[PDB]
């Protein structure tokens, strides 16, 4: 999770090109956690779809 | 991603176990015109099903 101080995006340790967080390619396990690092952002599903 | 002059599939590269192409099992990092050796297939996703 990684930004350019806004346009949080995704990417991994090979380049920038950055994406959006995109949950298809994000994992989830733990929700909202007392976990240190949250940044209070939000990422679109592709399948909202409405 | 392979074909045998027909259905388009994607295999790993160890086996051959074709799965018909799918956003599933696909990538995008940008634009169309940036990319070569394109097949150009339309990759099956199954959005017509959402």
């Given at each position: ?5 806004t346009?949080?995006?995704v990417?991994?340790?090979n ?12 994992f ?7 976990v ?10 592709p399948?909202?779809?409405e």
């Amino acid at each position: 999770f990684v930004s350019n101080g806004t346009h949080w995006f995704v990417t991994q340790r090979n380049f920038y090109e950055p994406q959006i967080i995109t949950t298809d390619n994000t994992f989830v396990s733990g929700n909202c956690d007392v976990v240190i690092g949250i940044v209070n952002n939000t990422v679109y599903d592709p399948l909202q779809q409405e």
